[PDB]
């Protein structure tokens, strides 16, 4: 029947988001030095396990409640939906993983991941996605969803939340040793396994297909448009950054091109079900250019992001959320809302996400760092995070 | 119709078990030294090819016969079923591969893989799964299946069999050079590509989803419960080992955490269709703890398992097989069988698997080693298995 | 309905061909030296992005027109079909990527990829596959397709075209430095990440399943035969090359074994929907042996192919195209065509593919190389292509 086919589609899409977890692991492990890559991989597995435990235990009840230790219910599609949203929560915290590499303590990162899976992501996902339970009859939406905020697959719910928490963490722990100098400016710390980073980017593209396809929530002939918009956004982001770099040398332009692919994917994540192919290409290309410029701006601002989580997930998420109101069809809006009123509503969603997913983690992680330091000692950072803290 | 959707589901699940082969290759290649990783990858491809040839030629006919060089039949679901069981047969010997790394001859490993795919796995799969032909009308079950032994996805048929012959092989060829010494105790040989082991573990999780989903054998609303039990078992195994290690340093605790993920998956493999989410979490966590203690016990017993096949596949398989009778619902048992009679039956299956998949390979591989030595010369083990034997 | 399930099948198959792109990236990045692998990964992402942009812009209109900047149409299956064929075009140019590694300039490779995605692949795909639009009512076939040429999944359209322009490129730019010498003959340049080539080969097998399954074009009970033929062709190619090598040392035989797997897949690609399992095994084994002999012949002919694109894709593609007329059932031919007439037609298709995909790219790339050199300077080849050109 229709319900069985929809259930298998959501299960295969959750499998694709597990592929996206593997791609995040490869992307982050290949972009760091060989003395820190094993710690990065251990972080990338540990946050996934901790977030799955936290979302099964209380995260699903916080995000979609009126749930705790989720068992079988009367709703047929709710188990597949729960698995998909658990994969989404793991995606948010493994976004947080990549920015804090090579200088953050493992237990402090585990505490940050617990904060992300316990309080920040379920509350904002309840605000933006409260009434989006798959197959449920009577679901009360969140206040942001009631006001008219639209996020198809989570450019704000998943990517911007992780970007804001990652920005707060890298502002609190500070930059790596030997990265920024007062005399010589900015030094580049290249990774040691950049082909693994390219493989991780391809796996992230593959997982992004499942992200958008399972966030579609139904099965008809227009899901192929969502897949085509996904492919065009990612490839046009990569193509635009490739055109910008063009004659720049390898081992530095590859990071920009892969970040452009990922940022184009982050931008089409907001509106993959409501835009055309030309709109998806335009949004992805502008997102890739914005990721390039935001990486340069973060380098000049002395903010150390190792894999450029903020130019990809945060800047791309804000651009995709704002470009939904510029490019999507008016039939997907609330009736009576024009193109500027929807821009005000999506800007309100961006500002609310910024306040809740940055300011509250900034105070909480600052208070945690005041009594429990999250930056390793300098001998650990020189020796490497593979060898203990 | 129903048959076409079921056939596509089994084909996609067999694709996921091919992903599981790729994850096994990455997990075993990253966990060894750089002078042996190419030989490990060559073993991981060659055993897959040899097992596929053997199962197409005679393995399917021995496992599910009343077949030889399988062609198209009248049964609609039996071709996808054959592909799925072929990938299961490849999974057993690629479990066998990881235990015998860095000191075993390539041709001797090919002979061991031929033994596994020719005699041991098809005969025990006929004993435990003989009547489980997908879509067939009249199928006579094996004697173990007729007695009441329940094994959903191969915790005994796949994982315990490969664990037993891997244990026999590492007992016959002996430990690696410079691994156990009489004076200073136990020395650790760390791998050189541990992020590739993390990627392999993620691919193994993803393929484990297909393992359980294709072993479900039907399509209804309860397959998402099987997927949720798979995710919760793997993540709770990893979470429990992470809680045990907590403050232990990296480059050694990552192996324990990934082994806990895999062992939790091995334990839920036995009963993923018959337990609740809390039961899946409990079984996976106990399996991860048991993998940790079994790795320690194998280190104290001077038994060299390179990637810890025995604590993951054998110990986890025995625990999952025994925990089916502790945790699963009584409606899945034979009518009239209580909770202790089922424990006796599953213990009989464990003992039968131990006898047939250990004692017969131990005598056969010992007789082969007496006339054809399966351990490399010491200059090959010092120089590396990438450079010939 | 049937249309929704077919659309989801084509979307999942296009996801599998994206996995094939990832596997190609791993296979080429692991087979080169560490001073060139980052440039190889950058090429493997850049050609994918450029080809997706080119096929969305004008490639689909040239291949399947009577389309430019493809948007939503009346045909329900055409969007998933477009995504699948875009994946096929990206597959052709990423076949081209692997032959020209370690000595070709990046911008010159981008121009070659533009030539492949703009002129060669869409025109030959229009000639061979012009009337194969999924779900269309009135589609005029190409002249080769009207003459009776059969290519199920593109052993000639995808693999032979990429092999021919890869051969033209490596004949124009020439061999690597320190590869062939007049005194000592042939020297071997081993890659530095051969386990990553094993992972890439497994990912290529996985995506090759999706290649054949989405090229099937319908859903019934005979798609499982296509999957079984795919598995048997790949595994028998690997098994035959493993039997040929047997006692040869590692670090060189693994390249032959993986190339045999891939070449068996290339040969079954032509006729996976029309042969038996024994025929698939025979075709795959002969293709693996032919890849081994063609690799030896290319090393004796002083033609430097880094990952052996020509023995795998070109020789395997020609063998699969010719073996369709030897092994497939007569019901799949044009009525009135015998077994020798179909051999003449498939040979005409092979000769037409050779002329159009070799002689025109050889002339165009020679004219481009006369005014714009595509081979790096010797200091760039000595230092490495990761550090600029």
Coordinates of N, CA, C and O in Angstrom, one line a residue, chain C residues 40-91:
Chain C
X40 N 44.2 14.8 -7.8 CA 43.4 13.8 -8.4 C 42.0 13.9 -7.8 O 41.0 13.8 -8.5
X41 N 41.9 14.1 -6.4 CA 40.6 14.2 -5.8 C 39.9 15.5 -6.2 O 38.7 15.6 -6.4
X42 N 40.7 16.6 -6.4 CA 40.1 17.9 -6.9 C 39.6 17.7 -8.3 O 38.5 18.3 -8.6
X43 N 40.3 17.0 -9.2 CA 39.8 16.7 -10.5 C 38.5 15.8 -10.4 O 37.6 16.1 -11.2
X44 N 38.5 14.9 -9.5 CA 37.3 13.9 -9.5 C 36.1 14.6 -8.9 O 35.0 14.2 -9.2
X45 N 36.2 15.7 -8.2 CA 35.1 16.5 -7.8 C 34.7 17.6 -8.9 O 33.5 17.8 -9.2
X46 N 35.7 18.2 -9.5 CA 35.5 19.3 -10.4 C 34.9 18.8 -11.7 O 34.0 19.5 -12.3
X47 N 35.3 17.6 -12.2 CA 34.6 17.1 -13.4 C 33.2 16.7 -13.2 O 32.4 16.9 -14.1
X48 N 32.9 16.2 -12.0 CA 31.5 15.9 -11.6 C 30.6 17.1 -11.6 O 29.5 17.1 -12.2
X49 N 31.1 18.2 -11.0 CA 30.4 19.5 -11.0 C 30.2 20.1 -12.4 O 29.1 20.5 -12.8
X50 N 31.3 20.1 -13.2 CA 31.2 20.7 -14.5 C 30.3 19.8 -15.4 O 29.5 20.4 -16.2
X51 N 30.3 18.5 -15.3 CA 29.5 17.7 -16.1 C 28.0 17.8 -15.7 O 27.2 17.7 -16.6
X52 N 27.7 17.9 -14.4 CA 26.4 18.1 -14.0 C 25.8 19.5 -14.6 O 24.7 19.5 -15.1
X53 N 26.6 20.5 -14.5 CA 26.2 21.8 -15.1 C 26.0 21.7 -16.6 O 25.0 22.2 -17.1
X54 N 26.9 21.0 -17.3 CA 26.8 20.9 -18.7 C 25.7 20.1 -19.2 O 25.0 20.4 -20.2
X55 N 25.4 19.0 -18.4 CA 24.3 18.1 -18.8 C 22.9 18.8 -18.5 O 21.9 18.5 -19.2
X56 N 22.9 19.5 -17.4 CA 21.6 20.3 -17.1 C 21.4 21.4 -18.1 O 20.3 21.7 -18.5
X57 N 22.5 22.0 -18.6 CA 22.4 23.2 -19.4 C 22.1 22.8 -20.9 O 21.1 23.2 -21.4
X58 N 22.9 21.9 -21.5 CA 22.7 21.5 -22.9 C 22.9 20.1 -23.2 O 22.5 19.6 -24.3
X59 N 23.4 19.3 -22.3 CA 23.7 17.9 -22.6 C 22.5 17.0 -22.7 O 22.4 16.2 -23.6
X60 N 21.5 17.2 -21.9 CA 20.2 16.5 -22.0 C 19.5 16.9 -23.2 O 18.8 16.0 -23.8
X61 N 19.5 18.1 -23.6 CA 18.8 18.6 -24.8 C 19.5 18.0 -26.1 O 18.8 17.7 -27.1
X62 N 20.8 17.9 -26.0 CA 21.5 17.3 -27.2 C 21.3 15.8 -27.2 O 21.1 15.2 -28.3
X63 N 21.3 15.1 -26.1 CA 21.1 13.6 -26.1 C 19.7 13.2 -26.4 O 19.5 12.3 -27.2
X64 N 18.7 13.9 -25.8 CA 17.3 13.4 -25.8 C 16.3 14.4 -26.4 O 15.1 14.2 -26.3
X65 N 16.8 15.4 -27.1 CA 15.9 16.4 -27.7 C 15.3 15.9 -29.1 O 15.7 14.8 -29.6
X66 N 14.4 16.7 -29.6 CA 13.8 16.4 -30.9 C 14.7 16.6 -32.0 O 15.7 17.4 -32.0
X67 N 14.4 21.3 -23.6 CA 15.5 20.5 -22.9 C 16.6 21.3 -22.4 O 17.3 20.9 -21.4
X68 N 16.8 22.5 -22.9 CA 17.9 23.4 -22.5 C 17.5 24.0 -21.1 O 16.4 24.6 -21.0
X69 N 18.4 23.9 -20.1 CA 18.1 24.2 -18.7 C 16.8 23.6 -18.2 O 15.8 24.2 -18.0
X70 N 16.9 22.3 -18.0 CA 15.8 21.4 -17.8 C 14.9 21.8 -16.6 O 15.4 21.9 -15.5
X71 N 13.6 21.9 -16.9 CA 12.6 22.2 -15.8 C 11.6 21.1 -15.8 O 11.7 20.1 -16.6
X72 N 10.5 21.3 -15.1 CA 9.5 20.3 -14.9 C 8.6 20.2 -16.2 O 8.3 21.2 -16.8
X73 N 8.3 19.0 -16.6 CA 7.6 18.7 -17.9 C 6.4 17.9 -17.6 O 6.0 17.6 -16.4
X74 N 5.7 17.5 -18.6 CA 4.4 16.7 -18.5 C 4.7 15.2 -18.2 O 3.9 14.6 -17.5
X75 N 5.9 14.7 -18.6 CA 6.2 13.3 -18.4 C 6.6 13.1 -16.9 O 7.4 13.9 -16.4
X76 N 6.0 12.1 -16.3 CA 6.2 11.9 -14.9 C 7.6 11.3 -14.6 O 8.2 11.6 -13.5
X77 N 8.1 10.4 -15.4 CA 9.3 9.7 -15.2 C 10.5 10.4 -15.7 O 11.6 9.9 -15.6
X78 N 10.3 11.5 -16.4 CA 11.4 12.1 -17.1 C 12.4 12.9 -16.2 O 13.6 13.0 -16.6
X79 N 12.0 13.3 -15.0 CA 12.9 14.0 -14.1 C 13.9 13.1 -13.5 O 15.1 13.4 -13.4
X80 N 13.4 11.9 -13.0 CA 14.3 10.9 -12.5 C 15.2 10.3 -13.5 O 16.4 10.0 -13.3
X81 N 14.7 10.2 -14.8 CA 15.5 9.8 -15.9 C 16.6 10.8 -16.2 O 17.7 10.4 -16.5
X82 N 16.3 12.1 -16.1 CA 17.3 13.1 -16.4 C 18.4 13.1 -15.3 O 19.6 13.3 -15.6
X83 N 18.0 12.9 -14.1 CA 19.0 12.8 -13.0 C 19.9 11.5 -13.2 O 21.1 11.6 -13.0
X84 N 19.3 10.4 -13.6 CA 20.1 9.2 -13.9 C 21.0 9.4 -15.1 O 22.2 9.0 -15.0
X85 N 20.6 10.1 -16.2 CA 21.5 10.3 -17.3 C 22.5 11.3 -17.0 O 23.6 11.2 -17.6
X86 N 22.3 12.3 -16.2 CA 23.3 13.2 -15.7 C 24.4 12.4 -14.9 O 25.6 12.7 -15.1
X87 N 23.9 11.5 -14.1 CA 24.9 10.6 -13.4 C 25.7 9.8 -14.4 O 26.9 9.6 -14.1
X88 N 25.1 9.3 -15.5 CA 25.8 8.6 -16.5 C 26.9 9.4 -17.2 O 28.0 9.0 -17.5
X89 N 26.6 10.7 -17.5 CA 27.6 11.6 -18.1 C 28.7 11.9 -17.2 O 29.9 11.9 -17.6
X90 N 28.4 12.1 -15.9 CA 29.5 12.3 -14.9 C 30.3 11.1 -14.8 O 31.6 11.2 -14.6
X91 N 29.7 9.9 -14.9 CA 30.5 8.6 -14.9 C 31.5 8.5 -16.1 O 32.6 8.1 -15.9

